[PDB]
PDB file of C-alpha atoms in Angstrom:
ATOM      1  CA  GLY A   1      96.661 116.943  79.890  1.00  0.00           C
ATOM      2  CA  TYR A   2      94.045 114.908  78.302  1.00  0.00           C
ATOM      3  CA  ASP A   3      90.262 113.700  79.250  1.00  0.00           C
ATOM      4  CA  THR A   4      89.843 111.194  82.025  1.00  0.00           C
ATOM      5  CA  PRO A   5      90.612 107.778  80.466  1.00  0.00           C
ATOM      6  CA  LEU A   6      87.677 105.173  80.935  1.00  0.00           C
ATOM      7  CA  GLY A   7      87.879 101.452  80.935  1.00  0.00           C
ATOM      8  CA  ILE A   8      90.732  99.084  80.758  1.00  0.00           C
ATOM      9  CA  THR A   9      92.926 102.239  79.594  1.00  0.00           C
ATOM     10  CA  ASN A  10      92.747 103.674  83.116  1.00  0.00           C
ATOM     11  CA  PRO A  11      95.436 104.177  84.755  1.00  0.00           C
ATOM     12  CA  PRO A  12      97.544 105.520  81.573  1.00  0.00           C
ATOM     13  CA  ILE A  13     100.102 103.370  80.241  1.00  0.00           C
ATOM     14  CA  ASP A  14     102.688 105.962  80.287  1.00  0.00           C
ATOM     15  CA  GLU A  15     102.452 106.527  83.860  1.00  0.00           C
ATOM     16  CA  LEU A  16     102.702 102.958  84.434  1.00  0.00           C
ATOM     17  CA  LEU A  17     105.675 102.494  82.312  1.00  0.00           C
ATOM     18  CA  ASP A  18     107.231 105.593  84.018  1.00  0.00           C
ATOM     19  CA  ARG A  19     107.872 103.333  87.060  1.00  0.00           C
ATOM     20  CA  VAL A  20     109.232  99.752  85.274  1.00  0.00           C
ATOM     21  CA  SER A  21     111.854  99.053  82.910  1.00  0.00           C
ATOM     22  CA  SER A  22     110.011  97.800  79.986  1.00  0.00           C
ATOM     23  CA  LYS A  23     106.564  96.488  79.407  1.00  0.00           C
ATOM     24  CA  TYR A  24     107.509  93.045  79.559  1.00  0.00           C
ATOM     25  CA  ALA A  25     108.558  93.452  83.076  1.00  0.00           C
ATOM     26  CA  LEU A  26     105.150  95.475  83.896  1.00  0.00           C
ATOM     27  CA  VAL A  27     103.137  92.615  82.689  1.00  0.00           C
ATOM     28  CA  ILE A  28     104.861  90.218  85.532  1.00  0.00           C
ATOM     29  CA  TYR A  29     104.751  92.989  87.919  1.00  0.00           C
ATOM     30  CA  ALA A  30     101.185  93.287  87.712  1.00  0.00           C
ATOM     31  CA  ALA A  31     100.581  89.541  87.116  1.00  0.00           C
ATOM     32  CA  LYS A  32     102.207  88.418  90.363  1.00  0.00           C
ATOM     33  CA  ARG A  33     100.532  91.031  92.451  1.00  0.00           C
ATOM     34  CA  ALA A  34      97.248  90.017  91.064  1.00  0.00           C
ATOM     35  CA  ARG A  35      97.636  86.401  91.930  1.00  0.00           C
ATOM     36  CA  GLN A  36      98.900  87.697  95.680  1.00  0.00           C
ATOM     37  CA  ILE A  37      95.670  89.605  95.766  1.00  0.00           C
ATOM     38  CA  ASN A  38      93.516  87.006  94.340  1.00  0.00           C
ATOM     39  CA  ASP A  39      95.144  84.010  97.041  1.00  0.00           C
ATOM     40  CA  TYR A  40      94.379  86.952 100.001  1.00  0.00           C
ATOM     41  CA  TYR A  41      90.595  87.169  98.877  1.00  0.00           C
ATOM     42  CA  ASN A  42      90.487  83.059  98.753  1.00  0.00           C
ATOM     43  CA  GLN A  43      92.138  82.920 102.181  1.00  0.00           C
ATOM     44  CA  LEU A  44      90.060  85.645 103.519  1.00  0.00           C
ATOM     45  CA  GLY A  45      87.623  83.224 105.130  1.00  0.00           C
ATOM     46  CA  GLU A  46      90.160  81.143 107.407  1.00  0.00           C
ATOM     47  CA  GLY A  47      94.310  81.354 107.281  1.00  0.00           C
ATOM     48  CA  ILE A  48      97.540  82.648 107.990  1.00  0.00           C
ATOM     49  CA  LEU A  49      97.388  86.364 106.967  1.00  0.00           C
ATOM     50  CA  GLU A  50     100.993  85.881 105.119  1.00  0.00           C
ATOM     51  CA  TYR A  51      99.804  87.417 101.869  1.00  0.00           C
ATOM     52  CA  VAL A  52      98.700  90.984 102.542  1.00  0.00           C
ATOM     53  CA  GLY A  53      95.627  92.270 100.711  1.00  0.00           C
ATOM     54  CA  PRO A  54      95.224  95.164  98.454  1.00  0.00           C
ATOM     55  CA  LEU A  55      96.957  98.088  99.355  1.00  0.00           C
ATOM     56  CA  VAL A  56      94.732 100.676  97.806  1.00  0.00           C
ATOM     57  CA  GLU A  57      90.950 100.469  98.676  1.00  0.00           C
ATOM     58  CA  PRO A  58      89.087  98.570  95.970  1.00  0.00           C
ATOM     59  CA  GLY A  59      85.976  99.685  94.415  1.00  0.00           C
ATOM     60  CA  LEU A  60      82.788  97.581  93.882  1.00  0.00           C
ATOM     61  CA  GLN A  61      83.793  94.195  92.757  1.00  0.00           C
ATOM     62  CA  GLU A  62      87.013  95.406  91.129  1.00  0.00           C
ATOM     63  CA  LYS A  63      89.108  92.855  89.544  1.00  0.00           C
ATOM     64  CA  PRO A  64      92.383  91.535  91.046  1.00  0.00           C
ATOM     65  CA  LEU A  65      94.514  92.951  87.868  1.00  0.00           C
ATOM     66  CA  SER A  66      92.789  96.199  88.096  1.00  0.00           C
ATOM     67  CA  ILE A  67      93.656  96.671  91.824  1.00  0.00           C
ATOM     68  CA  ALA A  68      97.160  95.491  91.206  1.00  0.00           C
ATOM     69  CA  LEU A  69      97.708  98.040  88.306  1.00  0.00           C
ATOM     70  CA  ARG A  70      95.885 100.909  90.119  1.00  0.00           C
ATOM     71  CA  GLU A  71      98.340 100.513  93.326  1.00  0.00           C
ATOM     72  CA  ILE A  72     101.450 100.133  90.737  1.00  0.00           C
ATOM     73  CA  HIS A  73     100.712 103.547  89.416  1.00  0.00           C
ATOM     74  CA  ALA A  74     100.382 104.708  93.300  1.00  0.00           C
ATOM     75  CA  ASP A  75     103.805 103.729  94.376  1.00  0.00           C
ATOM     76  CA  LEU A  76     102.810 101.297  96.902  1.00  0.00           C
ATOM     77  CA  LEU A  77     104.630  98.173  95.665  1.00  0.00           C
ATOM     78  CA  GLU A  78     108.467  97.347  95.099  1.00  0.00           C
ATOM     79  CA  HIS A  79     109.862  94.763  92.356  1.00  0.00           C
ATOM     80  CA  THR A  80     113.223  93.286  92.078  1.00  0.00           C
ATOM     81  CA  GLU A  81     114.061  91.988  88.366  1.00  0.00           C
ATOM     82  CA  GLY A  82     115.552  88.658  87.961  1.00  0.00           C
ATOM     83  CA  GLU A  83     119.029  88.245  86.086  1.00  0.00           C
TER      84      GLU A  83
ATOM     85  CA  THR B   1     106.753  98.697 100.001  1.00  0.00           C
ATOM     86  CA  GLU B   2     107.506  98.647 103.766  1.00  0.00           C
ATOM     87  CA  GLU B   3     105.532 102.126 104.241  1.00  0.00           C
ATOM     88  CA  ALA B   4     102.349 100.490 102.400  1.00  0.00           C
ATOM     89  CA  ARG B   5     102.428  97.420 104.880  1.00  0.00           C
ATOM     90  CA  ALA B   6     103.055  99.803 107.868  1.00  0.00           C
ATOM     91  CA  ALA B   7     100.275 102.037 106.322  1.00  0.00           C
ATOM     92  CA  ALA B   8      97.602  99.328 105.815  1.00  0.00           C
ATOM     93  CA  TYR B   9      97.911  97.825 109.286  1.00  0.00           C
TER      94      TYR B   9
END
């Protein structure tokens, strides 16, 4: 129940934290996936498709971190916490 | 997740 968020406040932070134990885990959860997406884009030209690109279809020139957050919010990723 | 990897390809 709220007006649609716009900018870097989308997706809403509470809905993201609903899926991760704590924000300190969420930051890594998003950063590692952003690195994976960036590596996939870098190797798009030629290379083994070991890193799978974005799951949710990206927008017109959307940053890898934003895509990572959006696909985290869509329940398409799984993470295991160290120690 | 396995379902996402299957759906994408």
